[PDB]
Design a protein around this ligand. Structure first.
Ligand code: NOY
Length: 438
């Protein structure tokens, strides 16, 4: 058996735009994902977050599912434009009401809320003023964060400033695949820097407003292996694509060496002037992890991926469970944060409801079991892993892939909004109840 420490936090995770629908209900302002998905050509099949899982209406049922499964923590995000429809200034009480009911319900049921302040649904009003490209977003984000802390910090004690700021910056502003759909490398690196500045101002506000809680930040991470002996190409991908891009500034006061070699010209001229503020102390690091990549020197960043004959998910992502052990070891070794969480881990497979009314996702069980086992390993070797969150509770709007990719441990029939707990959800409930694997 593999038992986890007493009090280890087993959770599930979602994000507001991916599950809620009703993006303009009850006085909410448009987000950049509303306007991006409503632009033809940006999302597969023309899918949008208009309805999604209708969590805006079905939230109680969904939390009752979390409760029924015995899951101990729920990581969810707040829609900024539901709270401040123009991004700054006016606060929308109906938006606060929506999350207040979710928080109170979770607490009543003994489930720990972990709140992601920003999971990509920037108010459209702020995008008109440059969004993450504008230095002033450090202020806008601090004002937003302060509203959340003032209204919710009496009850929510676990906070995440940003989800996957690399994706926000690079996929949103260089690749143009995500909102706001731009392709400018100078804008993309300004966004990196402003994400750090905004993250740090929010932590600063947090210390002033929620004197008894904890706050951290969440990064996407891949396991990059070298194709041969381009072991530097691996070094660059780690430093650029993984936690170092942000943690080197937070813990060491500068970007990683190979990031600076690639991107110095694209950063503001006097970017170091902001580093002392960026070092604002954080309480934990959240790492997301899905996939490994074989990398060789080559390509726009002098790096290309090499395909491998390994099992893959429906995303085409190679399944490399040891990657989660590696990234956990590596973060301790490099920055030694006081606490770590796996804030997302999961897989998309082509789920089908069998004639027996069940979803027999053995592929997903195998994926999660392998990764949980590797996380356990990291714990045995001294990594202060405090929790593990499965992405996701529900099949949902998977960004530019729309509804075509299902990551839930609960199946959603979008024609009816019926929820069907998958075999993986049942399996996970047992893991949680047992506090580990058997
Ligand atoms: O692509 C799967 C997930 C990757 N991480 C993001 O936080 C989440 O929103 C995505 O659905």
């Amino acid at each position: 058996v593999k038992k986890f420490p007493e009090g280890f936090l087993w959770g599930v995770a979602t994000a507001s735009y991916q599950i809620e629908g009703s993006p303009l209900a009850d006085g909410a302002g448009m987000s950049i994902w509303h306007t991006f998905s409503h632009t033809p050509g940006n999302v597969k099949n023309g899918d949008t977050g208009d309805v999604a899982c209708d969590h805006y209406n079905r939230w109680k049922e969904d939390i009752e599912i979390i409760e029924k499964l015995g899951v101990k923590a729920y990581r969810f995000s707040i829609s900024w434009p539901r709270i401040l429809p123009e991004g700054t200034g006016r606060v929308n009480q109906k938006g606060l009401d929506f999350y207040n009911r979710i928080i109170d319900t979770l607490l009543e049921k003994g489930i720990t809320p972990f709140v992601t302040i920003y999971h990509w649904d920037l108010p459209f009003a702020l995008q008109l003023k440059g969004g993450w490209a504008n230095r002033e977003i450090a202020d806008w984000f601090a004002e937003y964060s302060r509203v959340l802390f003032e209204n919710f910090g009496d009850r929510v004690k676990n906070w995440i400033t940003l989800n996957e700021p690399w994706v926000v910056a690079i996929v949103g502003h260089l690749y143009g695949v995500h909102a706001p759909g731009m392709r400018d490398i100078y804008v993309a690196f300004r966004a990196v820097h402003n994400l750090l500045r905004a993250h740090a101002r929010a932590v600063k506000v947090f210390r002033e407003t929620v004197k008894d809680g904890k706050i951290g930040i969440v990064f996407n991470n891949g396991y990059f292996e070298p194709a041969s002996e381009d072991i530097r190409a691996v070094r660059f991908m780690h430093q650029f694509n993984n936690y170092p891009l942000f943690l080197n500034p937070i813990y060491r006061g500068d970007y990683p060496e190979l990031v600076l070699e690639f991107a110095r010209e694209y950063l503001p001229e006097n970017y170091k002037d902001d580093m002392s503020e960026i070092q604002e102390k954080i309480d934990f690091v959240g790492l997301n992890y899905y996939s490994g990549h074989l990398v060789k020197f080559d390509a726009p960043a002098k790096v290309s991926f090499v395909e491998r004959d390994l099992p893959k998910t429906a995303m085409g992502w190679e399944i490399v469970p040891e990657g989660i052990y590696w990234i956990l070891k590596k973060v301790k070794e490099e920055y030694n944060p006081p606490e770590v969480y796996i804030t997302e881990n999961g897989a998309a497979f082509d789920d089908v409801v069998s004639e027996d009314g069940r979803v027999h996702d053995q592929n997903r069980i195998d994926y999660l079991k392998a990764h949980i086992g590797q996380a356990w390993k990291a714990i045995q070797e001294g990594v202060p892993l405090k929790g593990y969150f499965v992405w996701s509770l529900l099949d949902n709007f998977e960004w530019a892939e729309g509804y075509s990719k299902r990551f839930g441990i609960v199946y959603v029939d979008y024609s009816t909004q019926k929820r069907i707990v998958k075999d993986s959800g049942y399996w996970y409930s047992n893991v949680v109840k047992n506090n580990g694997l058997e």
